[PDB]
Symmetry: D2
Subunit: 265 residues, 4 copies
């Protein structure tokens, strides 16, 4: 009798064993959920990663910049979960920003074509994914996306921070549109986790030192501490929002960051 027992959940965003989406999937399966996974581009590599999950799960290709993939997504999910079955949850764990829009590269020097690609993948696709999956979502379902607190400007995060500001805004509109079908939409703002998309912050670096400083500053501010090597608290928080225990929460951000956002040293 797990937290997500019998729920059918779409999980995007696995690329390595460090991906936040891998741990969301792992924790969700251990909580009784039946998963459908999506992967971008390197499907054979992503299947090798998914094979280390607790349980088997169908894997569908999804490039969120590809209109055909999005137009066929609901039908392909239905083939994976069985005719007449619907999804109970959707996890958006997708982000990207070209190197010109991040790290030591100057903020003013990022060409808009690069910024627009990052905003397409990191913010607009939260709406795109919701539009594609809502037709096959049960009433009372839950859509969850991954956020990194963009309330204040930060070194290195640069245009990804801008994309997250846009994502938070998109989430409020997705909440409005999904609410008619009784579906909730929320973001989890995680503290920093050692992942690929996080390594994009260090770029062509000294890389360990920057990560150590990042983790140390975050840990010091967090009243309960912060471990960049431990994605599990973040995965659990996503599962809490996918469960039935927060049924009047939508359009919001839940902070899984050790409390670091609420303190000023």
């Amino acid at each position: 009798a797990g937290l997500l027992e019998g729920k059918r959940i779409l999980v995007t965003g696995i690329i390595t064993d460090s991906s936040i989406a891998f741990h969301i999937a792992k924790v969700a399966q251990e909580a009784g959920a039946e998963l459908v996974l999506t992967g971008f581009d390197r499907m054979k590599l992503i299947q090798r990663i998914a094979d280390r999950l607790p349980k088997p799960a169908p894997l569908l290709e999804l490039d969120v910049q590809n209109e055909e993939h999005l137009a066929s997504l609901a039908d392909r999910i239905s083939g994976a979960i069985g005719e007449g079955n619907k999804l109970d949850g959707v996890v958006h764990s997708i982000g990207f920003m070209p190197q010109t829009g991040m790290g030591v590269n100057p903020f003013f020097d990022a060409p808009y074509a690069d910024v627009a690609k990052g905003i397409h993948i990191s913010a607009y696709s939260y709406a795109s994914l919701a539009k594609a999956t809502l037709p096959i979502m049960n009433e009372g379902g839950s859509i969850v996306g991954m956020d990194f607190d963009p309330t204040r400007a930060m070194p290195a995060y640069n245009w990804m921070t801008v994309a997250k500001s846009a994502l938070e805004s998109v989430n409020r509109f997705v909440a409005r549109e999904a609410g008619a079908a009784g579906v909730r939409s929320n973001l989890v703002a995680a503290g920093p986790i050692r992942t690929l998309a996080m390594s994009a912050i260090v770029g062509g670096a000294e890389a360990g030192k920057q990560m150590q400083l990042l983790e140390e500053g975050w840990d010091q501010r967090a009243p309960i501490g912060w471990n960049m090597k431990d994605p599990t608290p973040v995965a659990k928080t996503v599962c809490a929002l996918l469960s039935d225990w927060m049924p009047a929460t939508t359009g919001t951000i839940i902070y899984a960051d050790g409390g670091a956002s609420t303190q000023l040293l």
Copy 2:
């Protein structure tokens, strides 16, 4: 194997079976928790209300303005749950503001003695309850308080809104202090609920419910505290172990929309 199986949780704030705390207690017991209840002033009446809960629970007297009640609270909890057993959760569901501080009474005319009493009960006591219970809380425990979004001024709520603004600030400092013991602290900001404390602020509840329901993408029912109670239990569980110092909105999404 419930959400709160085996957890020992202190629940303050029951006065009627409409109290948000009554439904927190009901949902928590149905989720496997063992409760200790507190009550203010009318102990026999509160016990009759607590008798309507799914399961029995010891009831302790607590007036949060009474220093002696607070200083002895941990010892009395230990007597109720057994020495060596510790609390896993504490629920603050306590609020009050004199009528001069609310309603049609002009905001400028509330005397400070009345405002100060309301801030004592509604905001400062979140810190005093935490100080009183943290000595017997387990690592990984959870303190949860009840909030009403004070980000913008509202008709009628007046100084209670100010008290909630103070409570949100207090919550961040309680998170800091409780964090050393591995204990989390968070608030649940509920939409309006038909309770005694709500009634004190004001047909008028019908207009409030209508506007809140309209703005909420998933709707809002002022007569249904269960979604709020469930949200409190989510924060009392082990499923949000990196969340502290924050506000979780159980308001139908109304705070995120502008009609």
Copy 3:
């Protein structure tokens, strides 16, 4: 001895005499500023509008999506104000979102190509205008952009609200970059004003529909605003921009100043 006496200020975004930028320019000139204006696309029409201002001002073409326009902007400004002279203020009063992204079209139906154009013009260009003008800005100068409070989702405004959320984030990074030059960057969040850009929320409305929607919009804003709100009066917004362009807020950067009657601070 006006508020902006002797200051050289670039003002973008005039298209008609209802434009918020027209009133920023008018009030700034009346406060002693010497302006350089920019215009997009309809240069002869915009010049005729600029002719209605209190004082003459050179007009430069600037399409913020045009890389060549941005790359030559500082040189063309220098040609207008004199080589080696510097700007004290820059006003970004530029916004656009295609009808697929705002108004009656469903939120989910906006194609990304359209959203991206709106975000380019409405949010990214705050950064590219800063990049283009900072080389000729005086230490202690001021960059100001126009915002519409995107903290909560709103009907009709849709992807323009998303773009303003991005703009607020961009503003904090522009503040970081411009701060190295001692230059401030801030946004003014205005209440609704009857302009071409704001009429985008009623695109396609027939008969009495546009007037009614505008009446409800103004009434709700006025009701929430403790000091009221008049959608036909851009002057309070223009004055607020001039306040940020002045020397009277020299420690304010990276923030949003609300010129909205206080409506954002109240919940009816």
Copy 4:
């Protein structure tokens, strides 16, 4: 013809020539304002400080915890400025929290009687001063109070931070009530300034401890501020208050203006 020429402004909160209120008063007088000053407790000492100001100003006693002082304040102001004359601005620059509630004392150890005294002086009195002065305020006037950003918990500031969170909420209600008179109400959130009130955060410090803590405070603020921060320079803060007292932000009420070098907008 200064920014505040001919305006009559009440300035509370002078105790020394380091007081933020002293510099608000100095800058406002240099901008043409006619001031009425108030002081708490040490009236003879405060007069000697006021003697150091550019221009003469009447000084009235005001303990904001004293009902009689508040009830007579408008009549005593009328006596200073002439019967039937009105104030254009009111500046609240008043704050206090006992040492049990701020500095090195543990957060959990503050008795409520002490916290309540601090909230009375630091937050409630913003409402009480507005109530006392609004009867003699011009339509379109301006009330400004001093804030220290309490969005996030901070070491040492402790219950003063809670009081400022309450003050921000009080400001939104004062804006609602004052709006009926056309009067604006706003807070200026200042960065740290070396004053008596700010020294409370190091109460009891010995040897080099106070200086070390003040250096870390300034260095952290200056590092986060894109335009820097100097704790010895209250003038940018004073200017910002004067900007809000002016006629240049006439649609702004219920809000917080950050005069903090931008530090609140950045995360290192």
